[PDB]
Symmetry: C3
Subunit: 140 residues, 3 copies
């Protein structure tokens, strides 16, 4: 499935100095999100900092959501992940996408302006309606 | 996609003192899960505790799963996340939903009865059948 | 949805000494991935190690991805999770699946050859095309 998603550029560097998120290849699942910062931010081991992206999206379709994930190299090699682990973006959220960057490792890390700091996937989601029962059907 | 899901209330406070999970808005991707506790649990930095929800679900449809995620504010601001990071709920699981709460930060945290401690999304899943090959087709 | 996925066995122990990933039940969302190692690896608290699986997959379909997640018991009980938290596998990735194993807890852990160290789910993904707008439609 392909989907057009409205995006608002909140910082005029986004799409210029800080490239807009793109899929690296036709078979890529995620887009990389970049740090929209004026200056580098040093992130000490154990600390968390909130990094703006300079953009907002409006998924709009309640059958879709986005999930923000760490980048594999940053996470594995540098211990730079998300403070909320996975960031869930609701279809009706229209605010700036913000990235909770957490240093889970032992080495201080410099977050540079424009650095790819997270990735984002769009996944279908199902809205559950709970049906209260006394007993389930037989299943395991 | 909308789906009705059977749920069993295991603790009679759930749906009363501890509200049943709901979608906050029509465009929300996730439902918040609450701590079904008799008394507050203090969670020291670095520690993990298993928190009951007082409910069980039976997704039943093998094309669907649920994923439990940290809440964004708890994770980012308080360092309160999941000890298994993401909790995968199988379609044929009928046990109580349990939340592994892990304090990944530096500040002790009081988990209160009724506190929203995680969120849960329902996502379609695909069951893979592996086809063993010597070589892949050309792709990157 | 069911999907056949091409897999290449890179280490001849995979499918023999190290069982190929399987769904435990018909309603299971994920498959367990095993450590393809010659000898046990001791993982001290706070440390990360890259563990091979001895296999490669080629999802091929750009409407599908895989996500690697911690196992619930390892994560909750032993503090053994993923260093990148969640591992996203692109449809056009044809390399060996590698698992970033991170000890987020306080107890040293022995990763044994053949140990189930992660699980993997296949989820539909949507490739977003951004549509730049000045203002969103009314939504929350
Ligand atoms: O890592 C994150 C997680 C969430 N959000 C945005 C998208 C969500 O729809 C919105 C509301 O989050 P909650 O307050 O409901 O958790 O915050 C982010 O920008 N980054
Ligand atoms: O955070 C979690 C993760 C899993 N489970 C339940 C749902 C799963 O289907 C079931 C089996 O998990 P495993 O033992 O297969 O990991 O445990 C939870 O209640 N909470
Ligand atoms: O935990 C992980 C995460 C990723 N990959 C593989 C699959 C991805 O498609 C590929 C490229 O990852 P990036 O360099 O784009 O993050 O690495 C793994 O083997 N394990």
């Amino acid at each position: 499935m392909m989907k057009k998603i409205d995006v608002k550029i909140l910082d005029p560097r986004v799409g210029k100095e800080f490239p807009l998120p793109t899929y690296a290849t036709s078979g890529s699942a995620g887009l990389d999100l970049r740090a929209c910062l004026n200056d580098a931010v040093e992130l000490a081991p154990g600390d968390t900092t909130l990094v703006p992206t300079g953009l907002a999206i409006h998924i709009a379709d309640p059958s879709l959501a986005a999930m923000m994930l760490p980048r594999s190299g940053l996470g594995h090699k540098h211990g730079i992940v998300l403070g909320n682990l996975v960031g869930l973006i609701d279809s009706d959220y229209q605010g700036q996408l913000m990235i909770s960057v957490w240093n889970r490792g032992q080495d201080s890390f410099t977050i540079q302006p424009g650095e790819r700091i997270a990735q984002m996937i769009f996944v279908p989601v199902v809205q559950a309606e709970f049906n209260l029962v006394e007993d389930f059907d037989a299943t395991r």
